[PDB]
Amino acid sequence: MIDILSSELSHMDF
Amino acid sequence: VQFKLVLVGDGGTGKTTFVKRHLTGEFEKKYVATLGVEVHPLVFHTNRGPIKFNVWDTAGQEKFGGLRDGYYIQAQCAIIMFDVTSRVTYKNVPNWHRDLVRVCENIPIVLCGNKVDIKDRKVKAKSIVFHRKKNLQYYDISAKSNYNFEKPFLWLARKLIGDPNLEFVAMPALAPPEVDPALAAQYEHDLEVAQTTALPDEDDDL
Amino acid sequence: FEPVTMEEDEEVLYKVRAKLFRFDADAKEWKERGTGDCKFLKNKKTNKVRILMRRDKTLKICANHIIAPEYTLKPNVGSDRSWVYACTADIAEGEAEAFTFAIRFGSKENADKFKEEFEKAQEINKK
Amino acid sequence: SMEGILDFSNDLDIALLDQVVSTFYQGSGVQQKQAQEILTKFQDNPDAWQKADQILQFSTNPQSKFIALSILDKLITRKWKLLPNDHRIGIRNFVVGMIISMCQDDEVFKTQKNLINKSDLTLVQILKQEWPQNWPEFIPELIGSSSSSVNVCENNMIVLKLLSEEVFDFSAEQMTQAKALHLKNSMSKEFEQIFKLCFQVLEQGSSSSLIVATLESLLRYLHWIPYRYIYETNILELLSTKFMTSPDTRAITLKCLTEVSNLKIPQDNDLIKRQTVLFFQNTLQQIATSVMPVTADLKATYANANGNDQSFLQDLAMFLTTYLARNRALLESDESLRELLLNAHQYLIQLSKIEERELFKTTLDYWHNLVADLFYEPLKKHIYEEICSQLRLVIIENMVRPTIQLYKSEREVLVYLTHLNVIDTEEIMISKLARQIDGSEWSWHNINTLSWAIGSISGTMSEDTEKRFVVTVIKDLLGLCEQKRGKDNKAVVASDIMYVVGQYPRFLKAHWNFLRTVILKLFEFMHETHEGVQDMACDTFIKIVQKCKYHFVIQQPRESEPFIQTIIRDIQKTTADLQPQQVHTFYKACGIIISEERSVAERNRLLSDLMQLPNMAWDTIVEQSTANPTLLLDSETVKIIANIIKTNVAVCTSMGADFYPQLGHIYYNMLQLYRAVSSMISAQVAAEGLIATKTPKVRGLRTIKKEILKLVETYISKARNLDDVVKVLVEPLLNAVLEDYMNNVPDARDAEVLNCMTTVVEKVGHMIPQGVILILQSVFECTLDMINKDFTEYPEHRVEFYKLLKVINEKSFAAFLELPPAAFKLFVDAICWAFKHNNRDVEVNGLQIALDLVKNIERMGNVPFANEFHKNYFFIFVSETFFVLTDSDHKSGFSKQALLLMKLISLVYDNKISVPLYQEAEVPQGTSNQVYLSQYLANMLSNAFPHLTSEQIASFLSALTKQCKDLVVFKGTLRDFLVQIKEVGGDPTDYLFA
Ligand SMILES: Nc1nc2c(ncn2[C@@H]2O[C@H](COP(=O)(O)OP(=O)(O)NP(=O)(O)O)[C@@H](O)[C@H]2O)c(=O)[nH]1
Ligand SMILES: [Mg+2]
């Protein structure tokens, strides 16, 4: 549940 | 199309400094006590036409009181001022208001806690509640940083005109003239002195 | 079913936040005149450039004059992010008075960039 | 030409007066300004009052008659008892007659309200002087004349209103305690007659103006009258029904009920309870039928601002909150009152939606009272489940950025609400967040407002429910960031996602991999160029480090080393695109982490690695700085140096005592730099003048000196090993800063030097007697000469100067004993100099030093220095204290002046001063200090206040001396004295109040 959440956050680009 | 505004409060609270900011845009550092009252016309440009306040800047020190409550006659609005760095000035607000509403039965009034720019604030917002029962409008303000410095006039305008949707607008900028060695000498003289006079508040962000 | 400003003829060449001072020779002391956005406005009709600066909140004009090719920017003794110069026709208060202006910015970068777009404008005022 | 009325030799020209007055109130420019100075000089003429009855009779200008009354008020207040008994009764007459004259004239009575009210107030000033002792028939005659006319009856209510205010509301600190109590008793003895008339007017009707004047006076009575005049009569029935229907009386009636509602009624009385429930029930009924239903949109009404809506809504908010904060318990028990109870709160829900900050703060203060009551009191929260549900929506929608006082209030209320029902709160926020994704309520103001609310309820849920909740929030927000395409829109969301995670440290502690991702992403944002992103990244970084400092210092299972080490390795690459300040914050945050390492060897090694960059730059500069001293003229060099020190100050702030190893690495060279920089400034001031202190080059050089001093303050203040401070740090410091400060021109002396010395003495000053002595010698006299000329110049040095003498006088008082006689004399001159400051940062310090100085001399016992002190400076301290107490320009410091003075008098009352305070010649040998103290004070007050009688002074001193053990009474006596020195003929028996 969290391991995905970590991956989602690490891909914040502009 | 003008309204009379009376400005009252203890001596040192910054009434004169506040008005000078709206007139010349300058910030007076020194404290020169006001003797009686100084009347200054102040104009604002709104989307309902130019509104004009006749600002009666009264004297806070009792020795320079002048006509005192004689200045409040036929006033159509008012600003009560105190210093958030001085408890005694907030302590004296009920006294100024008392003298004020005895002459002015029913007028829009603004309560202003000046000098919020100073770190060592002594009058906490939690304590400021005098305005609640007396139907006054309150604003944290500062003449040195212009924090909420337009708010008191904007609120009074919305009241005196009777339009809550009233805003301040930019005044039209007429084209400037596109322009003599007879005065070329004395101008550079005034520039040599200006150039070697250090600008005030050089540590400020602007 | 029936249902129920004078800046239009101009173009912005440069915009920068600044505080504006004026010199009071009668007391030998600087005085603020306004704080807000300083703009360079090029009239699309006359192709002439002017400085138009307004005060924040009140939006009152505190500077309104032509960037004449004659004017010269001088450094102030007390800073490196400010320029001092003489103006012979400004109408922020009505009549074309003469003032000794000083304008200050956030950094030396903005002051230097100001002088770049300032001299750029003077060349336009010649043409 | 207008200066004719200023000539009192010939008769006053009334026609000319009315012109000078009219020119003032209606004129402009110079003419108005000139007229102003004339009217001022006119009323301020001591003989002007004589020409009052003339104006009041002959003048046709209401403004003139107003100023005439002002001249009388000034006479009645200050010199009334001084007048022959003939004039006194004479003034009473044509003031009363004048009032009657205006009441009979319906024209004047309507069009000149301002002039009649001023006359009424003038009448009350006489009453405060004469009534009742010399006017016992005032009230019986007032009631009789109130039946002869309506206009007279109305005006009498105005007189009674003002009379009530001056006696109960503003009597304190205006009149003596005796005179106040006397007037209070007088009204209390005759109120039964006043209430009779008042109630008759309220019941019989019917003139609108008369009713309001009656209700407006009633409002003042409720401040002090006994409860029986409210409940044992049928007056509450009238207020809560009859007068709530008409708008003109509605506004004031609601204020009356607000004062009644704010009484701690006899809790055991079952009749007053029903009376308290009854009038509240009626009030809400009238509002619902005569003003607005409960479903009414009060937000839109307030915004439209028609007539007196905004005033009425404010008053309704003040009424409901006041009553329910006192009496809602009455409505909670009975079931038949449940509808009344919830309707009352439903009005407060609607009021809370109004966009008006000061009004919102008002209702918010009540909600805080309620939810806290429901959080502690049993069997209550089930009652307001519907009120609380709406309230959640209201607070979430009106959340502000974390003035700051408002947010904390909102958070505290919202935390309570989330505790009363977690499920409801969670549901509302997710729904609000779903309407943010579909773009219905999407905006920058609403996404931030929602984020702030989500972050404020942190730590209120269970750790499990919080996990499920946070994930759902961060998922929706990350899905929202992908949705937007604008580079600005993405910046708004990214900040909120980082704010939220910053608010849930418990979640971060449990999940390392997630925490690691965040920090690694903040480092990626520290390279972003968009405005605010870098500051947001550094703020969130240090914010997280403070709450999770333990997870950066230990070895995480899925890692090869403590994460702090990894940060230091790439610290250069991380902080590459940051501003000098943003770097300092980063280094500061790292310092918070390193400070958690309890192993001494490991902690010091992390410090060496963190300070690697600045130490390399430092050693490079220090090598090049001594080789080519003119490098300090280079701006870029001065900048680099300042940032190196600031980086040291930053880390030292986080680490405190654990920073000592780094300090030592640079300490000796840093003070060598302080010496080179000082020389460079002096060389500049001599070669360019005092203007050089304003130049960018010197200001940069002074920054280095101030940041170096700031570093030393920061350490020593937080140091644990005080032995190291004295042995190692103090000696090189003083020998580097003191002589430089002393031998600089005043405009080149950094006030931070004084503040640094203040920190040193506060911490180790008790261990450095020769050190404190050396400090005084260097900074005392030269600093005093900078500020003993006025109260404005050198404000920075002014405050730090008295802070330094304060701590010196506390810690190392011995240093003052070593001061030569002439130097100790300047020390006393400096303390009294601080008394006279209107500035509060100095005035308070001045008084405290004096107070501590006396206590110091006292505990020396009977010794030559202690006795010489009293002979020399005792009466000096007494008179100087009395001066600031009575000059009426230092009222800000009344309490401390009193405490000081009381300590001085008590020394004599207790015989704690062995030697005599007088010369063997001026008083017969054998006289006690007690007697001579009363002789000195008696003579002092006579010359300073020649308008006081000898009996006043004798009584005041007598009462003041036998009250020097009771401060609240002592203060009361001083305040009585302050009232009597502003008038003539003060009653000397007033000092027998206690
Ligand atoms: N820090 C700070 N100082 C202020 C501010 N406004 C005024 N002052 C300072 O307050 C002092 C007195 O200002 P002034 O306008 O004369 O007060 P006043 O109310 O007119 N006094 P008086 O009633 O005797 O005429 C000045 O020294 C001014 O620098 C402020 O907003 N911030
Ligand atoms: Mg003033």
Numbering used by the authors:
A (entry chain D): 6 to 19
B (entry chain A): 9 to 187, 190 to 216
C (entry chain B): 65 to 68, 78 to 200
D (entry chain C): 0 to 376, 414 to 438, 461 to 1052
What does the publication say?
We also reversed CPEB4NES (FDMHSLESSLIDI) to generate CPEB4NES-R (IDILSSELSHMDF). Both reversed peptides match the class 1a NES pattern and were predicted to bind CRM1 like the PKINES, which is another class 1a NES. When NES sequences are reversed, MBP-hRio2NES-R and MBP-CPEB4NES-R still bind CRM1 with similar affinities, KDs of 2400 nM and 780 nM, respectively. Crystal structures of CRM1-bound hRio2NES-R and CPEB4NES-R peptides were solved at 2.3 Å and 2.9 Å resolution, respectively. These structures show the peptides binding in the plus direction, that is, opposite that of their wild-type counterparts. The CRM1 grooves in the hRio2NES-R and CPEB4NES-R complexes are almost identical to those in the wild-type hRio2NES and CPEB4NES complexes (Cα rmsds 0.2–0.3 Å). The N-terminal helices of hRio2NES-R and CPEB4NES-R that span Φ0–Φ3 bind CRM1 much like the helix of the plus direction PKINES. Their C-terminal strand-like ΦXΦ segments bind in the narrow part of the CRM1 groove, but are placed slightly outward toward solvent, perhaps to better accommodate the large Phe and Met side chains in the P3 and P4 CRM1 pockets. The structures of CRM1-bound hRio2NES-R and CPEB4NES-R peptides support the idea that the spacing between the hydrophobic residues is critical for determining the orientation the NES binds. When the sequence and the hydrophobic spacing pattern of an NES are reversed, the direction of the peptide binding CRM1 is also reversed.
